[model samples]
Target chain A: EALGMIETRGLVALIEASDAMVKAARVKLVGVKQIGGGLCTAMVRGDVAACKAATDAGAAAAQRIGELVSVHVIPRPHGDLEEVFPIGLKGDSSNLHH
Target chain B: EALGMIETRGLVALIEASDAMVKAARVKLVGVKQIGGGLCTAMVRGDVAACKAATDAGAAAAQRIGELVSVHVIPRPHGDLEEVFPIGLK
Candidate 1:
């Protein structure tokens, strides 16, 4: 029944299942970013026990499509954007100094 | 006997015949530049009538090879460069 729901709705299905699995196991999915054409990065916020459960759930969900997935757990407060920039000039000119 | 003379040789015969025709037409062969991969550009130098005859002969030779040809008549000591450049550099 869960697999059928995921197969019908693609990424939305995976996200919902992941959220449910996190709540059931008592963890936090802090940030979810979809990168490149077809890769996903999820930042999980929790202690060691919750982090392990979240990692296992995320891996199991990602494995449905035969994609390799990994999880990283960090101790610090995560997902702060103090140094993230969306747009910036990216070339060198003779008059400009780095 | 004269008709039989040109049958044995090919381009040599045609060139010799063209030389005779130019003398008969009283034209000066000034400069000739072949362009493209197979196009020839001939600049004939002479009086107006001789230049016209040389142009006609060049057109006939080009026609024998079934290719496009052009002839331009300019005064003596003609031709100069117009423009030269290297491409695809910013």
Candidate 2:
């Protein structure tokens, strides 16, 4: 699994990024989070190639619209990273863990 | 009380901003928060004049080091703005 992220200084830019990312490939748009200082990031999950393609497309769109901080794609993020970081949004905490 | 905020793209810039803001006036250093994309912000609170002066001072320091997003001083921010937004950095 791969993680794709697009970070922007404006909400509109992030929105544009998310739109472009999803349209560019078969990735799941996880969620958008605001860190602070008017910065917003959109996260997506998919295969490595799809994540890379989506992130690249999103970065281009975000740059054209507003301030684009950066875009990144983690080919194979560590399992602990997923657990500690908020890369994945919670749909149902209680699952078939048992 | 007035609220002043200084935003920068780098953590070092924000640190410098916070240091300058506190030394420039008798304002309280509220807190600092990191926004995605390597952006960070320092917040202060005090009288209108103090906040304006502190923010101005901080902005100068932040601009010299890295990318400065913006600086703002709200003379009297609405209560709702504080409650809804993370302006206070709580």
Candidate 3:
């Protein structure tokens, strides 16, 4: 699965992006990253095509509502990135359950 | 002291604003707030006149570097705002 990220200037824009990302494709909304000074990023994951489409939808929605900073899609992010960053999917307790 | 806030679209812009805000007047750089999306806000505290000048300087710097969302100065902020919000001067 690919990784997609969308950063915006305000919460409203991020929320719109999140909603659009999930609705536009079969992607999973993984996490939200907040770096001080009102910068926020939303992360999602799915197949490359899905990730790309979702990011496009998300970015467009964010731009209409508030400031859209940047949007990117990783075809296959390095697995190590998941260990160091908070980009992992949420609510998947499969490892815990085992 | 008055409360001043400057919101920008990017970190670089906010950093520029924060630096200019404190250097432009006798204001105190108190805190930074991130509400998400690329929006970041820098807060400061000082007398009304100083805050006004600082915010003006900060806004101008932010605009030059990146997107400037908004800037505001409160002559006298409510005490409770500091308790509930992360705007307390750092």
Query: Model 1: clashing residue pairs?
Result: none
User: Model 3 segments beyond 4 Å from truth?
Assistant: A90-98, B1-90
Worst 10 residues of 2 chain A by lDDT: A77-86
lDDT of each residue in B1-90, candidate 1, tens digit only:
000001101221122223433443555433223223222333334565666665566445434423333334433322222122111011
Model 1 chain A worst lDDT run, 10 consecutive residues: A1-10
Q: Which candidate's DockQ is highest? A: 3
RMSD of each: 32.0, 10.7, 10.3
Error of 3 at B3 (Å): 30
DockQ of 1: 0.01
lDDT by residue for model 1 over A7-85, one digit each (tens)?
1123554475466547646565444434232333444445566666665666566566444333333232211111121
- After superposing candidate 2 on the true structure, give the runs of residues whose Cα lies further than 4 Å from its correct spot: A89-91, A96-98, B1-90
Candidate 3 chain B, poorest ten consecutive residues by summed lDDT: B78-87
Q: Give the CAPRI rating of model 3.
A: incorrect
lDDT of 3 at B49: 98
Model 3, B1-90: lDDT tens digits are 887877777899999989988999998888886774566677888999999999999989888989987776767654433543455654
